[PDB]
Design a protein around this ligand. Sequence first.
Ligand SMILES: [Zn+2]
Lengths: 159, 40, 158, 51, 278
Amino acid sequence: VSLLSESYNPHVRYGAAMALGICCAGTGNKEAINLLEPMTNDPVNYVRQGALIASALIMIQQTEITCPKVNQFRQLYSKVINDKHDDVMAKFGAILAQGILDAGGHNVTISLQSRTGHTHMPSVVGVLVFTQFWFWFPLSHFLSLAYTPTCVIGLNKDL
Amino acid sequence: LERIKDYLLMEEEFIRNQEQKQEEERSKVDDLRGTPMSVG
Amino acid sequence: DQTLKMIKILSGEMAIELHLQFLIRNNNTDLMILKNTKDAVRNSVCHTATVIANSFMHCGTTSDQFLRDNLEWLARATNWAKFTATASLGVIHKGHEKEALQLMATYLPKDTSPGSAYQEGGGLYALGLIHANHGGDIIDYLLNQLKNASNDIVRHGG
Amino acid sequence: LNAKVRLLREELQLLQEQGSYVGEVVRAMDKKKVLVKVHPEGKFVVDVDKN
Amino acid sequence: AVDTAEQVYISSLALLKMLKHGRAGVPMEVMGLMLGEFVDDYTVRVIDVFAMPQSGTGVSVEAVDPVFQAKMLDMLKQTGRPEMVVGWYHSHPGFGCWLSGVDINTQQSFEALSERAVAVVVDPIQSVKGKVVIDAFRLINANMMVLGHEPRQTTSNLGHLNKPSIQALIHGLNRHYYSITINYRKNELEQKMLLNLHKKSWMEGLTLQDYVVKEMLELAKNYNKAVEEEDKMTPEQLAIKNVGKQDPKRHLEEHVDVLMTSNIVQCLAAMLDTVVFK
Ligand SMILES: [Zn+2]
């Protein structure tokens, strides 16, 4: 993604930011989080809106201790929403990005891979449709299905 | 070296010179007036 | 007996209900963050952006407190974003399953507004989200509703 | 490196924008208003930019 | 009842006819009727465009000739398939793309006649294959102003609509109108024939005889090399210079690629000498 992230096309940069976020998913590669920050400052609003949402997908399953900029991205989302001068298109998904980080009260996170290594069928469907959510606003609901909980179930008996 | 006080007085005076709308009524006039106005 | 237990454990529907129980009992959701986003409104994408964002925060929790607090703000959304907003409500209620379908009867178009066809289509879309990833007679019932549904407006989300 | 040179050409899209008129300020008034005479025309009251 | 970021698809024939007719009438601001197709609210495609005969009245609704429209439509019915006109297409030379009160009066009549009533504003400012000065505008009702003018069900299309944004002159008269995105209609064989007629035809593609070559080449090769001999002195200066503080040294004189291409292509004439012929 890093070479693709810097390109003439607004679409290729926006796509690279979206791509980097989805492959890493909940996990953060550190290099990936660092790459996202310049994408946020990119002049095109279309690239900027993608960067804010992509950072949020990485931000779920993360806390300030684990990643230094987790609070800074949260402050950034509030700042862009607060600033009228910031483009309405640019802010677009920053409020949605706060929802992505706070999804299920932060309890749930996006994971496409089982511990066994089996691919999660809901996770892949939700993320792929979520990229088409920019093409279609209601496809955001498809992302909701792919929100695996970090909780553990421990029952001695089923009932 | 009392010159510094005198120089400060001159700089302060320049700063003082440098430091020398209605909710609806003014905004309506602002809309009525063009961004460029030509005097004739 | 053992046969009934083995079918139930394989189905895993009870585990989904337990996950819903975990979410409803424990949610680290801050209303103030939603209010801070709510105060700054472009009055266009913001209404849609906020409703989806709250839906992610309350997904499966069924805690639509933000929707309860604002009625005029919810009314501001146009008929289309409102269709998306009813579907977002389904994401919030996506955990009760059959119980959620009974809850959706309160949000049903005859119960709410007959005039808003997009709200009716959004309600059908919300019903699908609640039972999504599950095969059931309710899915067949949704198919029966689709047969009686309007060809375009209801089937936009139905 | 190739991206930088092409980006410079993308920057050259700026050359397309029309040049602003050059005028002399007769005097200034408050509320972001200045009296400026256009070089071949007449006095124009103008709104000052934020910069 | 809700507007969207609808896409107007311009067929190549409609665009080519509009610019050619516009160029002919650029001094007199010629106007014409756009034979578009209202396939659905989201997508509108102008399959064809026809030019109204020059009218003294102007781009006004009165200028449009009802008799001409009916007879032209009958000819379209007999040959191929006619389509209901989406709206009026016309050229404003002074202000690339702009909207006027006179324009709205005609636009209102077209809006009453149909629905989309798209209006196009092509102009003399142009580029060989990169200007697209033409822009499409649709008026917004004062009654509709209380309602949101254009509710968007799709974010990406609004972002594509956002890329053109607004023009400063258009911004001055933007109120009471909304810009509508225009895209080229799908071109396939049509693209292919112009594509075949570009390098082969628009550019030099004799092909049978596509391949001066040995007459003035010696002068050009000596002249460029002479420029290099003077130019290379600047690189000689950079290497000798300590350059502790970075300074421009007029390097990248290059011309090496230009010499390489010229000498090699002329040397490739050996293929003509012993292979293409005997
Ligand atoms: Zn006009």
